[PDB]
Structure 1
Amino acid sequence: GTIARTIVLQESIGKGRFGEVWRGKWRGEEVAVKIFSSREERSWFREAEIYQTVMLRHENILGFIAADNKDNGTWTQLWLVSDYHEHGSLFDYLNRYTVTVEGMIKLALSTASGLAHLHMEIVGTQGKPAIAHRDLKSKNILVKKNGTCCIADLGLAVRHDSATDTIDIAPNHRVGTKRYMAPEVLDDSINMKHFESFKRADIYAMGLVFWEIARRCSIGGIHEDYQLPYYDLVPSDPSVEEMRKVVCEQKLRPNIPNRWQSCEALRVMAKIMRECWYANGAARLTALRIKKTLSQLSQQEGI
C-alpha cells in the first residue's frame, strides 16, 4: 500500500460536517488527511467520487491525492488525502489579516477561476462534466502560500450530464450552509432538476464571499473588521426561516460601504457583488464573466 500505510498524523485540524481533518506527513511532505468512520462510508465515497472526476485538476481547486482505507487493528478508517495549505481557510485568512488591493484581487480572481472551472463542461473523450458546489463559503475555500485560493470541500457537489440535462445524484432536498443559501434555495422555489439553477445559486454564495474579502481590503490604513455575511441581521448558526425572512421577505443583502466607491478595484468588486445578489438567478453574472472582469482588473493593477 502506498498511501495511508505510509502517512503519519501529526496534528488535529478539526472536525467538520463529516469526518475529521489532520495534518499528516507523506513521503516527507505535509498533507491534509480527512478521516471518516465506517458508518460515514457514503459521505467518504461521494467526496472520493467528486475528486476523481476526469479533468478536474486545476490550480484553483484543492489538489486531491488519494482515497484509501486504514485498519489500526480495532477499526477501519476511510481516508481522503489532499494537498496541505498552511494558511487554512479563506475565513481564517480574512480573520487573521487585512489585504492590499493586489491581495483582494488575487483572492477574488482565483476563487472565480476555480468556480468557472468547476462550472465548465469540457467536451471530449477525456471530458469533464459541469459541476455545481452547493456549499460555497469562505470556510470551504483555502488560501495557498502564493496568496491565491483553491476551492475545497467538494463533498456536496452535483455533476451534470449535458446530453440529457440531468444531475448524477438527482438532488431533491436542500443542503449547504444556511447563511450562504441563495433566495430561491431558502424559499424552495429553486427547480432542482435544472442544473443551471445550481450554478446560479453558487454565484450568489461567491458574491457573499467577495463581500467578506472586500471588507478586509486596507487602503490608507482604512478597512472594516472581519464579519460573516448577514452578521448584522441573523444569529450565529441561523435557521432557514431566519435567513428566508431577511433575504427573501425583507429583501436585504450585506451592506456595501460608501468608501468602496473610492477606488476602481473596490467599485469593480461592489458591482460584481450586486450582480451576484439578484433574487432572480437568471440575472446573475456567470463565474466565467466574473473571471473575465477580474482578470482585466488584475492587468490594470499590474499583479
Structure 2
Amino acid sequence: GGTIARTIVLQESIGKGRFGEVWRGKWRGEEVAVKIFSSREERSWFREAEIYQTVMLRHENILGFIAADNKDNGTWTQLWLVSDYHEHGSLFDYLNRYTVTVEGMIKLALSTASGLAHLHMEIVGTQGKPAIAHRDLKSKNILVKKNGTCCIADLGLAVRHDSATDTIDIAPNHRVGTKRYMAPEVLDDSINMKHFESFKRADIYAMGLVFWEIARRCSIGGIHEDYQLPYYDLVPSDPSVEEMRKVVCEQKLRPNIPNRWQSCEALRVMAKIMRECWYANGAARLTALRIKKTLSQLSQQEG
C-alpha cells in the first residue's frame, strides 16, 4: 500500500487557506504539515503539487515539500499535500506575538529575500528550473522556522517562465492575490502580463510591505511599534480593489516610515529598501537578488 497519506495520523487543525485546509500530523515518528483538498478542488491541489515538484526548487527559505497523495476513508477521497511543519506558524503570527532584535529583523528579512531570489531565478541545465513568480506574497504566507529564519509558502498561485521561448506555463488572470498587498499596476490593471518581469516586480512591492511589518517590531532600547498590516491606517480590514486603488494609485500613499528608524543603521537600510520596492513603476524597483546582497552585506557588519 501507499507510503504517505495512508501512514499519517492527523492531530491538530491549523486552518483554512485559499483552497483546502491545513493540519499538523505525524508521519514515521515525525511531525509534518498536511494540506487537505476535496475532490472538487483537484485543480488547485494539482497546481500547488506541480509548483512544489519543480526541479531544483528546494531552498532553505522555501517550504520543504514532501509529497502529493490521496487518502480514501471508505466514503470519500481527500487530496493531500505533505510538507515540513513549522511550529511558529506564519510571519504574521510571529510578529503579532513577538518583537525582534536588530539581528532578528535582519535574519527574517534576509531569509525572505533569499527565498524570493531563488523562486525568481532561472537555473540552466538538464535539471532546468524556470523563473517563478509567487503572485500572493504576504506575511501570512511566510513561515518562521525554529532557527528564526523564514521560508516562503502558498505557491498555488505561482507562474513559471521559460526564457528561451518566452512563455508562461499558464494563462494568468488579473488580480488573483491578496488585495492589500497588490502593486499599483496590479490594482489598476495596467500590468503587462505578457512581460514576465512584471510578475517579479509585483512580488518585490509586496516584499517591501512585508519588510515594513518586520521593521515595526524591531525593538531597540525597549522602543518599537505595535503590529500592523500595511495600510492599517488607510483602508478597511478586508479592503476592496477600489479602496486600495484610491490609496495606492491615486493618493499615492505608502506605509508610514517612522523617523525613529533614521537613528539606526539597520533600520535605515531597511527603510531605503522599502522605498525602492514601492515606486509606482515596477521597472524602478530593486530585484530580489540585489536586496539579498544588500542585507547579506548588512548581516556581515552587524554580527
TM-score of Structure 1 vs Structure 2, range by shorter chain: over 0.9
Is 161-170 or 284-293 further displaced after alignment?
A: 161-170
Structure 1 residue ranges without an equivalent (≥5): none
Q: CA deviation at 1:126?
A: 0.7
Q: Provide the secondary structure at the position in 1 that maps to 2:45.
A: helix
Q: Provide the secondary structure at the position in 2 that maps to 1:77.
A: strand
CA distance in 2 between partners of 1:227 and 1:174 (Å): 23
Structure 2 residue ranges without an equivalent (≥5): none
CA distance in 1 between partners of 2:65 and 2:75 (Å): 27
TM-score under structure 1 normalisation?
0.99
- Retained in 1: the 8 A contact 2:174–2:189? no
Q: CA deviation at 1:174?
A: 1.9
CA distance in 2 between partners of 1:66 and 1:41 (Å): 15
- Retained in 2: the 8 A contact 1:89–1:139? yes
Q: Provide the secondary structure at the position in 1 that maps to 2:83.
A: strand
CA distance in 2 between partners of 1:35 and 1:50 (Å): 16
Q: CA deviation at 1:165?
A: 1.3
Q: CA deviation at 1:170?
A: 2.1
Q: Provide the secondary structure at the position in 2 that maps to 1:193.
A: coil
Deviations 1:251-278 (A, max 9, x none): 0000000000011100000000000000
Map of 1:101 onto structure 2? 102
CA distance in 2 between partners of 1:103 and 1:24 (Å): 29
Deviations 1:77-99 (A, max 9, x none): 00000000000000000000000
- Retained in 1: the 8 A contact 2:102–2:219? yes
- Retained in 2: the 8 A contact 1:87–1:144? yes
CA distance in 2 between partners of 1:173 and 1:138 (Å): 21
Q: Where do 4+ consecutive residues of structure 1 move more than 2 Å? A: none
TM-score under structure 2 normalisation?
0.99
- Retained in 2: the 8 A contact 1:170–1:193? no
- Retained in 2: the 8 A contact 1:171–1:193? no
Map of 2:84 onto structure 1? 83
- Retained in 2: the 8 A contact 1:106–1:147? yes
Q: CA deviation at 1:173?
A: 2.5
Deviations 1:82-134 (A, max 9, x none): 00000000000000000000000000000000000000000111111000000
- Retained in 1: the 8 A contact 2:174–2:186? no
| Map 1:37-186 → 2, pairs under 5 A | 37-186=38-187
- Retained in 2: the 8 A contact 1:256–1:270? yes
Percent of aligned positions that are identical: 100
- Retained in 2: the 8 A contact 1:20–1:34? yes
Deviations 1:131-185 (A, max 9, x none): 0000000000000000000000000000001012111002132200000000000
